[PDB]
Design a protein around this ligand. Structure first.
Ligand SMILES: Nc1ncnc2c1ncn2[C@@H]1O[C@H](COP(=O)(O)OP(=O)(O)OC[C@H]2O[C@@H]3OP(=O)(O)O[C@@H]3[C@@H]2O)[C@@H](O)[C@H]1O
Ligand SMILES: Nc1ncnc2c1ncn2[C@@H]1O[C@H](COP(=O)(O)OP(=O)(O)OC[C@H]2O[C@@H]3OP(=O)(O)O[C@@H]3[C@@H]2O)[C@@H](O)[C@H]1O
Lengths: 176, 177
DNA sequence: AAAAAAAAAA
DNA sequence: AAAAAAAAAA
């Protein structure tokens, strides 16, 4: 389950054309074609097995609309997402290795290779995300009203994941 | 064939002889019989006569055979004790390097990097061809050899034209072209 | 003239 | 949650 969901993230977010799949402007690909692509590496994968990963994913990583499937965030190619805006959250969190602090405190959170900067409404998931890149990880606290007043709307892309264009430095209130 | 074996011989004698189960002495020498068997793990058709042909015909004097022992004469990334003669004849020496290294070289000077010694040449072509290994935009550095000797950095005759030195201070670099 | 296995950033 | 064959700095 974890292995296929990882390769599903690589296909839907980064290199769908590597498997001969062309996503539409919303990032959607046909579920039938992705199953055949997943079968190129793991032949035992079925459409039901794919619907299990989407239905049970603890982050709401994937979305199925009719006969199409997409990753809801994490893209490195630009897509057109229709997620609802988050006007509720007061604070948002981002985990990052300690080495990135001088540049983040100066330039703010940039999207890097992804289309959007990714933050979370949860401290654990934010810190867990940052641990993917290093050992000494710090928790960044982001004033969500600071972002809105500066014209950077936050969108509800996952259960707790939130995407935003970028985070200016003075919207980071605390590093722990 | 000849260029492929000579390349692998450069990797064993200069960089990782332990990977092939070879322990060099303090001069960098390895038994010629043991190196032949090491080259046979990759290229089974290599014989001692083939190896001796590479040493005798190498256009840079890369390798030295003393009795039953063989060594690379320079290029080492592990420290060795070389007995090469001192170069007291050369007035100028040459070093090729990519254009991007110039600001650092002009400030810190030529440093050995991963090798034991800085490598220069008495020949301009070989110096530029050495730098071409690292990039396209290569520049020719001119080195006053008296500047080096006066500053206590002796130059040694390691190859036909290759010369090894501890380091090259910046103000011994007279020209970059 | 520093070969080449095998692991995995962003 | 970016898989992964395969090539090659210094
Ligand atoms: N200005 C700046 N200078 C230097 N460095 C900066 C920077 N401004 C930002 N940085 C750092 O650059 C990294 C990019 O890495 P990148 O993978 O693009 O970003 P993230 O770690 O946010 O991951 C995304 C999603 O992917 C996971 O998978 P998922 O479980 O589906 O969700 C999770 C998660 O939401 C990151 O360390 C960030 O601080
Ligand atoms: N201060 C500084 N800053 C930045 N950069 C610097 C530097 N001070 C020096 N640098 C550059 O760092 C490179 C090291 O690369 P490295 O391969 O170690 O050096 P060389 O290119 O001199 O090659 C060795 C032998 O290897 C070939 O094989 P060979 O035919 O047997 O002989 C030939 C040759 O003598 C090099 O670009 C140098 O300028």
């Amino acid at each position: 389950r974890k292995r296929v969901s990882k390769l599903m993230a690589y296909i839907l977010r980064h290199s769908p054309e590597e498997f001969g799949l062309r996503p539409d402007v919303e990032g959607f690909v046909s579920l039938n074609e992705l199953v055949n692509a997943l079968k190129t590496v793991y032949p035992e994968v079925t459409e039901e097995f794919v619907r299990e990963i989407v239905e049970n994913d603890p982050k709401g990583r994937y979305e199925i609309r009719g006969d199409r499937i997409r990753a809801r965030y994490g893209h490195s190619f630009p897509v057109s997402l229709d997620h609802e805006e988050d006007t509720e959250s007061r604070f948002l969190y981002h985990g990052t290795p300690r080495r990135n602090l001088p540049s983040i405190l100066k330039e703010g959170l940039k999207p890097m290779k992804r289309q959007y900067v990714h933050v979370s409404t949860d401290k654990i998931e934010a810190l867990e995300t940052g641990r993917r890149h290093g050992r000494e990880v710090v928790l960044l606290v982001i004033d969500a009203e600071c972002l809105r007043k500066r014209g950077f709307k936050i969108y509800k892309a996952g259960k707790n994941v939130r995407i935003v264009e970028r985070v200016p430095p003075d919207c980071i209130t605390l590093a722990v």
